[PDB]
Design a binder for these strands. Structure first.
Ligand SMILES: Nc1ncnc2c1ncn2[C@@H]1O[C@H](COP(=O)(O)OP(=O)(O)OP(=O)(O)O)[C@@H](O)[C@H]1O
Ligand SMILES: Nc1ncnc2c1ncn2[C@@H]1O[C@H](COP(=O)(O)OP(=O)(O)OP(=O)(O)O)[C@@H](O)[C@H]1O
Ligand code: NA
Ligand code: NA
Lengths: 220, 225, 226, 50
RNA sequence: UUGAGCCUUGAUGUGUAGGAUAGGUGGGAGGCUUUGAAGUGUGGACGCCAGUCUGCAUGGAGCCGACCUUGAAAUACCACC
C-alpha cells in the first residue's frame, strides 16, 4: 500500500518548492512511526581519487531526531574534563582493549592525542563499522571538554560514497517546516564551506528530502 | 645435438616410487621405462605432478619409498620448468660453461657460445641483465654441450622465439637418445613425442587416443561439478 | 592517448631503439611483437617509470592507474593471500606509514592515515582477495599456503590475480599464459575481451593473440612499426 | 662522428649547465663531475643530463 | 532492420567459519498480509547447479527485526544510487 498509493500520488517529472515539498511530505505520514526526515544530496566529486575526500560536521538547533551517548577516551589525566562532560560512555586505556571486545561503542568517539589505544584496538571493530576518530573531520582535538560539549548538541556528520553522495539527518517530521528550512540551509552552508579544492563543476547536482519510513522526493 | 654413447639398455630401475614431497604424497604409480629410443610426452592438468616426475627421474627429489635407480652411464639433460633461475646468476656464460668443462678448452671455447646467440662481449656478464629469452637459450646451450643421451624438458619453449622453436623442434626430431618432454603446444608433441602418457590423479598411466581425445577428455571432467 | 615520439632507448652500451614513434588511442587493446632480446620488457619498464627514456618523452596521461604483470616470479615465503594483497598498492604504503606513526607516536598522523585507509575499502581487502582467488580455482586451504611451492601453473594464477585486485586503467600483461592450461586460458581471454581499460600485451602465441588484440607494435630493426 | 652532445647541469638548484660531448657507445655511465657555479660562486657537483 | 546517448520501471549480483547466492553508504529496530497470509498443485528465467525466482487460482489471513558465526551485518521496509 505504501508503495502503491503515494507512488501514484507523487510525480517525478517536476521539482517542488523547498517548503511545499516538505509540507506534502509531512502530509504523507505513511508509517505508524515518528518518521524522522533525512536529506540526500548528490555532490559532484570524483570518488575514485583520494584527494577529494569530504568530511565535515554541522549543528541543527531544532531537531536531531535522537540522543547519542558520546564516549570520550582520554589517556592519563585526560579524563579531568571527561568526568564533567557527562558523556554516556566511559573512557580508559585499560577499559579500551576489553571494552572493544565486550561492548560495541557509543554514538561518537573521544580523541586522546596521547592515548593511541583506540586506533590500536579498534581496527575492524572501531573503523569498519564507521565510528573511528577523524583528525581531519574534527574528532581528535586537544579540547576534550569542548568536543564532548559539541557532540551532545547534535553534531551531524557525513561522508562520501562510491558515488560522491551525502545523506544524513535533519530532524523529525514533527519539527516545523521553518525549522527544516533553517536546518537545510545550515547544512548546505557547512557543505559549501567544506567543498574541496580540486572540485570542478557544480557541487550540488541534486538535493532531496526523504521520509525514512515512507517516500522521499527531490526538494530543490 | 651431438652423438653420445647411448650404451645403458636398462635406463633406470623403477619400483614402488611413492613420490610425496614430504608433507603429502604426489605420485605412487609409475609407467613403462624409457627403453632407449622411446619418446614420451606427459599430458595432464596443472598441479598433477608432471614436474615432480621429471625431477624424480632427474635425481633431485629423493622418493620417500626409495630406490628410484639410474643406469651407470647416463648423461642427463634437464630443463626445469619455472626454475629458469636455477643457474647461478652472478657468473657470466663463459665462466659458467668453463666450470662445466674445467680443464682444457681455451679462450676459443667462446667460439662455441658465439654460434648460440651470445656473439659479442655478452659472454662477460650475466644477471637478471639477460632477458628471459636468452636466459632460456643459455640453459639449452649448456645442455647441448656435454652430449646428453637422456633429455628431460619441462616446457622448454616458454620464453623461446618462433625461430628458436623451429630450431629446437628440428633438432629434437633428429635427436637419438631417450626424450621426455612436457608441454601444451600441439606442434611439439605432434612431431616429436610418440607415447603420450597421462598423469591423472596420483598415478601415471599409458592413456589412450591422441591430443584430440585428450582435449575433450579434459572438458568431460567438468561434469563432476 | 599514449604517445612515443623519437624514443631512443639505449641499454648500457647497446641501443634498443634508434628513433621510433607510435601512438595508442585510449580503449584499444594492443599487442607487442618482436624477437628474443629485443626490448619489449624494456618498453614495459619504461612505462612502469623505472628506466630512463634517454630523450623520448613517452608522456601518457598521468591520471591513470597501472596494473602490471612481470616476467619472472621468484620463490617467496609469503602466503598466497599476502602475495595477492601486495598487488593492491597504496595500501602497503599506507600501512608502512601507519607503522612508522605507531612506533613514533604521531597522534595527528594516526588519525590521518586511518582516515585515508577508511577512504578505500581497506578492512574488506582480505575478503575481496579471497573472492577473486576463488574464481581462479583454489579452495580455502591454499590461502595460507606459501607461494614457494604452488606448482608452476598455479603460481602464474597467483601473480595474474595479483593484477586484478586494484581496478586499474592501464593493464600491462607480459606473457600471461606461460604455464596456464586451456582451462584458464579461456577464462583469461573471456575476461580480457570484456576488459574496459587500455591493455598492452606481450605474447608469442598467435592463437591466443588473435581474438583479443586490435593492433600490433612490431619492434623489428631498432624501430616500431604499427 | 660518434660522439654525442650532453649537458651536465648543476645540483645547486639553479639553471646553469656546461655543455660537452660524450661517447655513448663505449662508456656506459652518467658523468658526475664537480665544477664552479658562478650563480652561487661555489664549487658544486655537476651531473650529466638531457 | 540496426547502433549511441538521456528519463523511468523491474530484475542483477556469497564466500571462506554461516539458518542463508550478508553491493555500498545507515534511517531505523518493526511495518509488511489484508484492493484479503504462509504452504500445497504449476510454468518461466537465472543458475558461483547451494539456491533465487515470479503469471494464475486454490489455500484463504500471516512470517520476517530480536539473539545467531563475522571484514561487515541484514531484501523489516525505504531513501540516493
Ligand atoms: N636489467 C638489465 N640491465 C642491463 N641490460 C639489460 C637488462 N635487461 C635487459 N637488458 C638488455 O636488453 C636486452 C633486451 O632485454 P629485454 O628484457 O627488454 O628483452 P625482451 O624484448 O623483453 O625479450 P624477451 O622476449 O626475451 O623477454 C637484453 O638482451 C640485454 O642486452
Ligand atoms: N616444493 C614443493 N613443496 C611442496 N609441494 C610442492 C612443491 N612443488 C610442488 N608441490 C605440489 O605438488 C603438486 C604438483 O606440483 P608440480 O610442480 O609437479 O605440478 P605439475 O603437475 O608438474 O604442473 P605445472 O605445469 O604447474 O608444473 C602440487 O599440488 C604442488 O602444490
Ligand atoms: Na612442471
Ligand atoms: Na622480457
Amino acid at each position: 500500500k505504501r508503495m502503491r498509493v503515494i507512488r501514484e500520488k507523487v510525480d517525478a517529472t517536476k521539482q517542488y518548492d523547498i517548503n511545499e515539498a516538505i509540507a506534502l511530505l509531512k502530509e504523507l505520514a505513511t508509517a505508524k512511526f515518528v518518521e524522522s526526515v533525512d536529506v540526500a544530496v548528490n555532490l559532484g566529486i570524483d570518488a575514485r581519487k583520494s584527494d577529494q575526500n569530504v568530511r565535515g560536521a554541522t549543528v541543527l538547533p531544532h531537531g536531531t531526531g535522537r540522543s547519542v551517548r558520546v564516549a570520550v577516551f582520554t589517556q592519563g589525566a585526560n579524563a579531568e574534563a571527561a568526568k564533567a562532560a557527562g558523556a554516556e560512555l566511559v573512557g580508559m586505556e585499560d577499559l579500551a582493549d576489553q571494552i572493544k571486545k565486550g561492548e560495541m561503542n557509543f554514538d561518537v568517539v573521544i580523541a586522546s592525542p596521547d592515548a593511541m589505544r583506540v586506533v590500536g584496538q579498534l581496527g575492524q571493530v572501531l573503523g569498519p563499522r564507521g565510528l573511528m576518530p577523524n583528525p581531519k573531520v574534527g574528532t581528535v582535538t586537544p579540547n576534550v571538554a569542548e568536543a564532548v560539549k559539541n557532540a551532545k548538541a547534535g553534531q551531524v556528520r557525513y561522508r562520501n560514497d562510491k558515488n560522491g553522495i551525502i545523506h544524513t539527518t535533519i530532524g523529525k517530521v514533527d519539527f516545523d517546516a521553518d525549522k527544516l528550512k533553517e536546518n537545510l540551509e545550515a547544512l548546505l552552508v557547512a557543505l559549501k564551506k567544506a567543498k574541496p579544492t580540486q572540485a570542478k563543476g557544480v557541487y550540488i547536482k541534486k538535493v532531496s528530502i526523504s521520509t525514512t519510513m515512507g517516500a522521499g522526493v527531490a526538494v530543490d | 645435438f651431438r652423438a653420445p654413447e647411448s650404451l645403458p639398455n636398462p635406463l633406470l630401475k623403477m619400483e614402488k616410487v611413492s613420490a610425496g614431497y614430504g608433507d603429502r604424497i604426489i605420485l605412487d604409480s609409475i609407467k613403462l621405462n624409457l627403453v632407449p629410443g622411446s619418446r614420451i610426452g606427459l599430458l595432464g592438468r596443472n598441479g598433477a605432478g608432471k614436474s615432480t616426475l621429471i625431477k624424480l627421474l632427474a635425481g633431485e627429489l629423493a622418493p620417500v619409498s626409495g630406490e628410484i635407480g639410474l643406469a651407470k652411464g647416463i648423461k642427463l639433460g634437464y630443463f626445469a620448468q619455472h626454475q629458469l633461475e636455477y643457474l647461478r646468476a652472478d657468473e657470466s656464460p663463459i665462466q659458467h660453461l668453463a666450470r662445466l668443462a674445467p680443464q682444457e678448452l681455451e679462450q676459443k671455447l667462446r667460439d662455441y657460445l658465439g654460434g648460440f646467440g651470445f656473439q659479442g662481449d655478452k659472454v662477460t656478464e650475466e644477471t637478471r641483465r639477460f632477458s628471459g629469452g636468452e636466459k632460456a637459450r643459455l640453459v639449452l646451450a649448456l645442455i647441448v654441450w656435454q652430449r646428453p643421451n637422456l633429455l628431460l624438458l619441462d616446457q622448454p619453449t616458454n620464453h623461446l622465439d618462433l625461430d628458436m622453436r623451429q630450431a629446437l623442434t628440428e633438432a629434437l626430431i633428429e635427436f637419438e637418445g631417450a626424450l621426455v618432454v612436457v608441454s601444451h603446444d600441439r606442434h611439439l608433441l605432434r612431431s616429436t613425442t610418440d607415447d603420450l602418457y597421462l598423469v591423472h590423479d596420483r598415478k601415471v598411466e599409458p592413456f589412450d587416443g591422441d591430443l584430440e581425445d585428450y582435449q575433450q577428455w579434459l572438458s568431460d571432467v567438468q561434469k563432476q561439478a | 592517448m599514449i604517445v612515443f615520439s623519437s624514443l631512443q632507448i639505449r641499454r648500457g652500451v647497446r641501443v634498443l631503439l634508434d628513433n621510433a614513434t607510435a601512438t595508442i588511442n585510449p580503449g584499444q587493446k594492443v599487442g607487442l611483437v618482436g624477437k628474443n632480446g629485443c626490448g619489449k620488457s624494456t618498453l614495459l619498464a619504461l612505462l612502469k617509470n623505472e628506466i630512463s627514456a634517454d630523450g623520448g618523452s613517452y608522456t601518457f596521461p598521468g591520471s591513470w592507474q597501472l596494473a602490471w604483470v612481470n616476467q619472472e616470479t621468484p620463490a617467496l615465503p609469503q602466503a598466497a593471500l599476502e602475495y595477492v594483497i601486495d598487488g593492491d598498492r597504496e595500501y602497503r604504503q599506507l600501512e608502512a606509514q601507519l607503522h612508522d606513526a605507531n612506533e613514533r607516536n604521531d597522534g595527528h598522523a594516526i588519525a590521518t592515515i586511518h582516515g585515508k585507509l577508511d577512504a578505500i575499502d581497506a578492512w574488506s581487502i582480505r575478503s575481496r582477495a579471497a573472492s577473486l582467488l576463488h574464481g581462479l580455482g583454489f579452495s580455502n586451504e591454499q590461502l595460507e599456503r606459501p607461494v614457494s611451492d604452488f606448482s608452476g601453473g598455479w603460481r602464474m594464477r597467483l601473480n595474474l590475480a595479483q593484477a586484478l585486485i586494484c581496478r586499474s586503467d592501464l593493464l600491462l600483461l607480459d606473457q600471461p599464459t606461460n604455464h596456464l592450461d586451456l582451462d584458464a586460458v579461456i577464462w583469461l581471454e573471456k575476461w580480457l575481451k570484456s576488459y574496459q581499460g587500455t591493455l598492452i600485451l606481450i605474447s608469442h602465441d598467435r592463437d591466443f593473440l588473435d581474438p583479443i588484440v586490435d593492433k600490433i607494435i612490431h619492434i623489428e630493426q631498432q624501430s616500431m612499426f604499427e | 662522428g660518434i660522439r654525442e652532445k650532453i649537458k651536465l647541469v648543476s645540483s645547486a638548484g639553479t639553471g646553469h649547465f656546461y655543455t660537452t660531448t660524450k661517447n655513448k657507445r663505449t662508456k656506459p655511465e652518467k658523468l658526475e663531475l664537480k665544477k664552479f657555479d658562478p650563480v652561487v660562486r661555489q664549487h658544486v657537483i655537476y651531473k650529466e643530463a638531457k
